[PDB]
Amino acid sequence: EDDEFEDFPIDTWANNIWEENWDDVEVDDDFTNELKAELDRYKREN
Amino acid sequence: XXXXXXXXXXXXXXXXXXXXXXXXXXXXXXXXXXXXXXXXXXXXXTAEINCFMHLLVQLFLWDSKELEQLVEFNRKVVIPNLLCYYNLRSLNLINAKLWFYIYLSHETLARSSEEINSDNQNIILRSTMMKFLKIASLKHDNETKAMLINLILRDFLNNGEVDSASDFISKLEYPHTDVSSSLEARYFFYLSKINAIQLDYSTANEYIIAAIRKAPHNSKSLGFLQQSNKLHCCIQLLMGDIPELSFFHQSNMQKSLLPYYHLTKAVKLGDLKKFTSTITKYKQLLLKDDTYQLCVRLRSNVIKTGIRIISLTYKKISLRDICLKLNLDSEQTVEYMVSRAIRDGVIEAKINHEDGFIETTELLNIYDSEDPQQVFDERIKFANQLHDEYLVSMRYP
Amino acid sequence: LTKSLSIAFENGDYAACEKLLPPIKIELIKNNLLIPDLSIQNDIYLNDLMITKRILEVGALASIQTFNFDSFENYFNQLKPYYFSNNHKLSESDKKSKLISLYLLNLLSQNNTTKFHSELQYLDKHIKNLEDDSLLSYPIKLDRWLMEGSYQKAWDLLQSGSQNISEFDSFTDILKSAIRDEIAKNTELSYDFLPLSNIKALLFFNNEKETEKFALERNWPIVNSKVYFNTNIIEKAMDYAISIEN
Numbered sequence A: 001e002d003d004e005f006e007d008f009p010i011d012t013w014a015n016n017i018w019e020e021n022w023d024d025v026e027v028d029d030d031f032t033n034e035l036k037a038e039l040d041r042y043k044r045e046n
Numbered sequence B: 001x002x003x004x005x006x007x008x009x010x011x012x013x014x015x016x017x018x019x020x021x022x023x024x025x026x027x028x029x030x031x032x033x034x035x036x037x038x039x040x041x042x043x044x045x046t047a048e049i050n051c052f053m054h055l056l057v058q059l060f061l062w063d064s065k066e067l068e069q070l071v072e073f074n075r076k077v078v079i080p081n082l083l084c085y086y087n088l089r090s091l092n093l094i095n096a097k098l099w100f101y102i103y104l105s106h107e108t109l110a111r112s113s114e115e116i117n118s119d120n121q122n123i124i125l126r127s128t129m130m131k132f133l134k135i136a137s138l139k140h141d142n143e144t145k146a147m148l149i150n151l152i153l154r155d156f157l158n159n160g161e162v163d164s165a166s167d168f169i170s171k172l173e174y175p176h177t178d179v180s181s182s183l184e185a186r187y188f189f190y191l192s193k194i195n196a197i198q199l200d201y202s203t204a205n206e207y208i209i210a211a212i213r214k215a216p217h218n219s220k221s222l223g224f225l226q227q228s229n230k231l232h233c234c235i236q237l238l239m240g241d242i243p244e245l246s247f248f249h250q251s252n253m254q255k256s257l258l259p260y261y262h263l264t265k266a267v268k269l270g271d272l273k274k275f276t277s278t279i280t281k282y283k284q285l286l287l288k289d290d291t292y293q294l295c296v297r298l299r300s301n302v303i304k305t306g307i308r309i310i311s312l313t314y315k316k317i318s319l320r321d322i323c324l325k326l327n328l329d330s331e332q333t334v335e336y337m338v339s340r341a342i343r344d345g346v347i348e349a350k351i352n353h354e355d356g357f358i359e360t361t362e363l364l365n366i367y368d369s370e371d372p373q374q375v376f377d378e379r380i381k382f383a384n385q386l387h388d389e390y391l392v393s394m395r396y397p
Numbered sequence C: 001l002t003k004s005l006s007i008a009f010e011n012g013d014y015a016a017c018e019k020l021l022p023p024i025k026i027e028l029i030k031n032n033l034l035i036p037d038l039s040i041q042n043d044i045y046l047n048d049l050m051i052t053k054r055i056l057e058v059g060a061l062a063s064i065q066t067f068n069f070d071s072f073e074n075y076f077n078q079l080k081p082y083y084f085s086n087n088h089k090l091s092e093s094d095k096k097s098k099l100i101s102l103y104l105l106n107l108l109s110q111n112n113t114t115k116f117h118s119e120l121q122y123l124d125k126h127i128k129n130l131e132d133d134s135l136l137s138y139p140i141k142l143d144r145w146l147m148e149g150s151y152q153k154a155w156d157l158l159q160s161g162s163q164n165i166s167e168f169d170s171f172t173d174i175l176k177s178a179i180r181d182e183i184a185k186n187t188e189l190s191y192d193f194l195p196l197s198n199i200k201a202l203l204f205f206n207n208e209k210e211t212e213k214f215a216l217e218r219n220w221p222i223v224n225s226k227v228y229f230n231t232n233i234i235e236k237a238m239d240y241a242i243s244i245e246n
Helices: A022-026 A030-043 B003-010 B018-028 B035-044 B047-064 B068-087 B090-110 B116-139 B142-158 B163-170 B181-197 B204-213 B222-238 B258-269 B272-287 B291-312 B319-325 B331-343 B371-392 C002-011 C014-034 C046-065 C069-084 C095-109 C113-127 C137-148 C151-160 C168-190 C196-203 C209-217 C233-244
Strands: B316-318 B349-352 B357-360 C193-195 C226-228
Touching (some): B003 B018, B003 B035, B018 B090, B047 B068, B047 B090, B090 B116, B090 B142, B142 B163, B142 B181, B163 B181, B181 B204, B181 B222, B181 B291, B204 B222, B222 B258, B222 B291, B258 B272, B272 B291, B291 B331, B291 C113, B291 C137, B316 B319, B319 B331, B319 B357, B331 B349, B331 C151, B331 C168, B371 C233, C002 C014, C002 C046, C014 C046, C046 C095, C046 C168, C069 C095, C095 C168, C137 C168, C151 C168, C168 C196, C193 C196, C196 C209, C196 C226
Antiparallel strands (some): B316 B357, B349 B357, C193 C226
16 A cells, blocks of 8 residues: 655755744744833833 | 567557556656667658657757757647647547647747747737637646636746736636646645735645645655745745744755845844845845745734734833834834734834833733623633534534 | 627627627627637647637626626636746736636635635645736735624725726625625624714715615614614423433
């Protein structure tokens, strides 16, 4: 019960142990940096 | 020498299902070959093995990478040979491996150069394949039928004809019972596909799922799974159901799914410009298969997502702001799009026009009243006849 | 006969074309048993196919105004080998560029989406030299915008068919209505309450009275410019029981 599948070639190319939620790989990295500017930006005005 | 196997393979010439087994090792019987070993058959001469040795010629060439006289061979030789095999019943099973290659190089030949001689040739080709598709259909050889069917389907989709193939299926009955699971999954594959392009999704995920089940695995059977799944992600996505990450991490295949893994990140977020940008990024990559024009349909789905998220995260929003979050030009654009989303059973809102803000519907208490009675009742009954059904199909012991 | 069609379309009257076709259909039955399907791929044969194309072409173009739509699909089906057999000489006629687009648009008019996208996939590998969509963006784009659900651009295309204008104006009047119900069928569930001027704004009326024409046709009760769009428990118990003790 073996056939070559020569018709479907395996793709040719031109060249984290924990399971992830997507938002794991959201990983937008923003908040740490955006925050500080938000905090101080605020309290300079008040 | 090694030709003993060729003689030992001829010891498989006794009767009936031996051929099946005969084929199995013959799958790997092509590991060693020589032109002088060709002279073996020269000394070996019967016809029922004549076609088979022609198989060995094809296998020899295609593996040897020379396609010219392989197809040239298909014509000049196979046609004389083809007539003889028609009388035989056993030969039809053997020829399937034959046909499997016949089309192949020809298709592969199309990737060498463009000529209308290839056109007329392949018109003849398909024509024949339908001819003794009918002939074999009356001869009731399941395997060679299914194979041939698959080959002409693959022809329609190397062409652009989904419809001709569809109505073709409409008049088809498939040799279901006795098959090769690989051919079965080639069928379910093509089937699911064309059934999808026609914009009916909910039956496509079925046949492709079966193309996952019925397919073998090994190390060779990969590319079929790689390719299929490259489709399966598309259907799952169009239908509106995001696939889970582990679907994008499975085996070697995970290197190929990458653009799709850049689509869902685009889709789930519901941010159009990122989507479009990605489509431009990977476009050419997505063209090597035809999943492309499937994927470019998502522009509907993406926006649906955008609306649904803007809904779940806000009770009521001025149209202005939705139009900002979705980047769109005009509010007038919006309430067309949102008015659409509502009808589709997505948002469950209403729209305040004169102030122009969407308001999403609430849960409105009512527990102390009898509405939970009605609701629970419907759910109950619909649980019963599930129980019923599962006891009606239960009868078999 | 062979000059009769020349006199029909060169005549310029498409009812003269129309009823002038059936008498040609017979010599197209014999010649049909001769010329079409072009299997011979013969070089000197070029004349037969050259004429034949234009024959069916005015078959379709005439078929438009005459409501004969499906028929020329047939013709279009019959035309398929001609433009889609690769050649520079065979596939040229601009009646292609307008005709195909006409056909796609037909498919939209009939709300057959399956056939439509199937056709997209078809045309793709042939036209694959395709630059944007030159004329053909009209039906395509016309489809994508209503797929997404942004109509205003679509309606705009309906205003933009007049540049290349042909009798698909009729189709326009089809598609136009085909859109409005949508918005209607949309807005029915959208929100219950509209000022008449706003209905005019949505449905792309240039008229105030066409509105309540439509709304009556839609059965919408109208208030002065402003429209509005709108088992005992014991039993249940015994029901659960009798369902259990079967």
